[PDB]
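Note on ligand handling. Small-molecule inputs were canonicalized before submission; formal charges were left as drawn, and no protonation-state enumeration was performed. Where a ligand contained multiple stereocentres, the stereochemistry in the source SMILES was retained. For flavin-adenine dinucleotide, this procedure yielded the string shown in the input block below.
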Amino acid sequence: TLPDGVSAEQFANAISEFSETIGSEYVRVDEATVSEYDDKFPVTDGDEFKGSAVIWPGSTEDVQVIVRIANKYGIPLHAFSGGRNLGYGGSSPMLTGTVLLHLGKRMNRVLEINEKLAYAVVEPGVDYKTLYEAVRDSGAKLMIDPAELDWGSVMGNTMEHGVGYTPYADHSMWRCGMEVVLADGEVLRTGMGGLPGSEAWHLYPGQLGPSIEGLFEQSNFGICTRMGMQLMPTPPEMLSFAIYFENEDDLPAIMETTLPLRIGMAPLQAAPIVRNVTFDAACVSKREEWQTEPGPLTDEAKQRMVDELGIGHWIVYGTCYGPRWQIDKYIEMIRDAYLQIPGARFETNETLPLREGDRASELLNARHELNTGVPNRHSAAVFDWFPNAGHFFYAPVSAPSGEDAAKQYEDTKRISDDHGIDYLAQFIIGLREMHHICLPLYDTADPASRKETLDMTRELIRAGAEEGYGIYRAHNVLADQVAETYSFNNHIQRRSHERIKDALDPNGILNPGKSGIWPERLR
Amino acid sequence: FRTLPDGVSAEQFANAISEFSETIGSEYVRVDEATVSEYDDKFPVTDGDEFKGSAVIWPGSTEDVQVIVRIANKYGIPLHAFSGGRNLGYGGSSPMLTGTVLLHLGKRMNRVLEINEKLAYAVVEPGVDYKTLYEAVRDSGAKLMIDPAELDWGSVMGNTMEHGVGYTPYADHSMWRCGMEVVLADGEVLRTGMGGLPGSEAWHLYPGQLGPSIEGLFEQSNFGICTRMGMQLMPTPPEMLSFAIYFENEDDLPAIMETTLPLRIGMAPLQAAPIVRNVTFDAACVSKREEWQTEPGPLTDEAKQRMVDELGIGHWIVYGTCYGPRWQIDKYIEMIRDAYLQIPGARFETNETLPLREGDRASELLNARHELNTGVPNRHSAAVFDWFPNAGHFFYAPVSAPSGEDAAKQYEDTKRISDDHGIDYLAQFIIGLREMHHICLPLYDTADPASRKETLDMTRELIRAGAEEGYGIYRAHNVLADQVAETYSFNNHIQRRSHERIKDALDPNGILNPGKSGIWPERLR
Ligand SMILES: *Cc1cc2c(cc1C)nc1c(=O)[nH]c(=O)nc-1n2C[C@H](O)[C@H](O)[C@H](O)COP(=O)(O)OP(=O)(O)OC[C@H]1O[C@@H](n2cnc3c(N)ncnc32)[C@H](O)[C@@H]1O
Ligand SMILES: *Cc1cc2c(cc1C)nc1c(=O)[nH]c(=O)nc-1n2C[C@H](O)[C@H](O)[C@H](O)COP(=O)(O)OP(=O)(O)OC[C@H]1O[C@@H](n2cnc3c(N)ncnc32)[C@H](O)[C@@H]1O
Ligand SMILES: C/C=C/c1ccc(O)c(OC)c1
Ligand SMILES: C/C=C/c1ccc(O)c(OC)c1
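Structure output:
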């Protein structure tokens, strides 16, 4: 494949210059190597979102040279740390023929772990597993904040405004100090890193004038080669809980209970999750175990998952932190509040410890593990729900309100049911905001499921925008439709993003079209 | 006209004033010396025309702001917009360039637009100050508390945009900002984050949207004019109990810092950043200089010792506050007490152990901190203006790695430097979580040209020495902007040059407050 407006000789000359600056063993055009950077969870069938080549730079100097050669020959680039952005297009570029930079392959060192000041400095390739292991080996009484899959890049996940499940869940809030290669090949150090000799680079997200660290999120402005991540100091004790609710109709009550227990950062010291039974089922069992006809999951089938697994139609997971006096008081208030809802049931990772054959204990231990800074790949089990199960995220943000959540659930199961797509649901109250994660399970190998999933997600996006719900994160194929819903004053936001894009990337080199931000030369 | 922007003639300027008058109303466009002089830096450190606006305009709406900005583009007239214009120690309401037209949004755009108890936020216009917002919250009956700076006349919005801070767990004002309406440099209205989505109720809930957040860009910059801003408000805990800890040697500073860091980094038991004040700071809030020293040179060792002994405080005082149920406060207060009381000569009081008494100045100082730390705005710190006749300040505020070895270094160096120039040195350390602000608050004679030159030379002193040791200023007076911006020298000032690329993209005519934070529009470079 080949980037539109670039000839094979123009492309060949860039490749030969990439090969003499980095070494041809690190510049890959062989189909086998480039195939692996295609979207693992596609929802399209042709030559959309296909890389032409992938480069494995080994240093910040390497990245600078590649970027300079890309400007010289006007070759679009797409840089990433892990390339495992499943649900959002993985490692696939926005434009066909884009040259891909997998930084994580070689630039993958944990550079610093600082116990006294409780932060680490990581390169793109450090994933949750490696950092977890590097802290544990250092002896530092610090914990990480991982996402559900331990192969995620600590840096890359940050770049997407990605979140974990401890009090440090908002990764963008705790990143501090980036080394960024700007679109013209120059190195920038954000914050106090701009000051020779300063030890505050990973301490204070500030400097004279405005911070631009936030500019490098879900954006195409720069390539990050090093990043500081602030780490929660390990408390004396941690206790996880599960709360089981009997009824689909309990969803509003669960939200209305949660907001006043979360907003004051106590007794819910971390954002608790609310997932429907289908989500939990899929992490410990296969679909065929519960139904058999290929249609929408019936009420009879869902009911079997609740009874057999001994869980609820909705399940709340959370964790309390500190010494026991605090945990007991906090656990008592959480237990006390939620059990107002008739039929609710409350367990702890002590009352429901991990026992062999007990599935409800296995998926509590999974949440306890993530919530106490231990990464695992337990959610990967959803990929076996059926053969070739993959996902395609609809993730709107709304105010935390009982029947604000009920209509999103009630409208989302309708629209997924109309397309015969399985609907896995996870709600999160951050503090004042509510994330709805619709996690659809569709057959990645069957084009019928691909189109059914795209048409469905495009309908949910009209449905969300119509009800005042905005998507905060979107797959490559959804970028333009979602960008377009932020419509105030003739898309003044997209046009603001675009002025910044043209200021930092005058030549339109970095992953054109990311988040609906198109360079000047592509309008 | 009292002054003129460089490159604009008296008639070119007069023609621009007529259009402002035509579109906003002449009663809201003022060039008279009596009115504009009102808006000169109250704490100047220069003697001439430097930083003197030509006129002041009082817009009454966003739509008025837009019109003013479009006119300024047509006529090529630089603007400097502010909310309350009371940014004392940083240039007050003065602009970077002489002859700049000032926009005082707060005189008429001063409504509290909403108080939401369920979701614990309020929405304010530029004119709303801490006292106003507190009174509006209290009248609402919402169990919410604000986070003020020292002086209640400070603007909620204006302070946030200077990256300013209070003293509750909601101390980081820029953190709890959520949802701005901004007039851009071409007169076009932007709504940040979820404000972009018609119908969204999350505009002041989630500081996010598809793609980059740009709220961060309107901080210590000249890219836009904010007409409306959401500020998330801490829900009121069940109880709050403030404390002061008196330290006997001014050598106790390194021990105070080392004790504090493991108490603060985990957000407990120090639930908010305590401050570490020197004795001269606390004296100035409850007394005048000549009550301890008549001789006008640097404060001698006995003058400080007299302050320590008569007021019944320490050479260093720590002030903090615990929040939550009575069972939580009791556990936290005692970790804090036991940790600090291990410093020999230390004494601990709470606002129950040392309640407000008339004449008990120690009890007044603690009551003032107890008020700020529980969200009750006051002017108690305004007393420093009376330390002597015409006493004003001029901030040196570096940020460093929280280290007792750093704090002593910064204190000893700033003292030796301020003593060389005969300027009083009020010192306050605040330990954020993983970072330490050093606030150097000098007190100089704002009406004396000799003192202004001493203070400016002293601060240029201190910026060179901070830069020498790797201590960077995060906030500086107009007259300090270029020197401070130059300290961020990594890769031939890639930070400054990045600032300017964004400046030129959002302000192609270079209208908005040129030179703010070293960010010069292309046309002046
Ligand atoms: C299938 C799935 C996915 C998932 C999840 C559960 C399941 C079952 N749970 C998640 C969760 O709890 N939280 C979360 O944030 N994401 C979750 N996901 C999605 C996904 O697995 C993770 O987000 C994953 O960590 C993302 O992959 P990775 O970490 O490898 O990120 P990347 O692909 O390398 O980067 C993503 C994009 O960011 C920009 N980027 C990344 N690095 C750079 C650098 N160095 N410079 C510039 N830009 C960079 C690019 O836009 C890149 O494409
Ligand atoms: C003398 C003094 C000062 C002081 C202090 C103690 C003393 C004794 N303690 C402070 C503290 O604890 N925390 C803090 O943040 N500041 C403290 N100061 C300094 C000062 O008193 C306050 O910061 C004060 O709140 C600032 O003044 P104000 O609130 O009136 O802000 P402003 O002049 O309107 O704005 C300052 C600058 O911000 C930009 N700005 C402001 N509003 C806008 C709008 N609407 N649009 C665009 N930009 C805006 C401008 O650059 C303006 O100059
Ligand atoms: C099961 C949760 C998936 C997920 C995907 C994207 C996200 O941003 C996210 O935040 C918790 C979660
Ligand atoms: C006495 C405090 C002065 C001060 C000045 C500017 C600041 O940003 C500040 O932060 C606590 C404090």
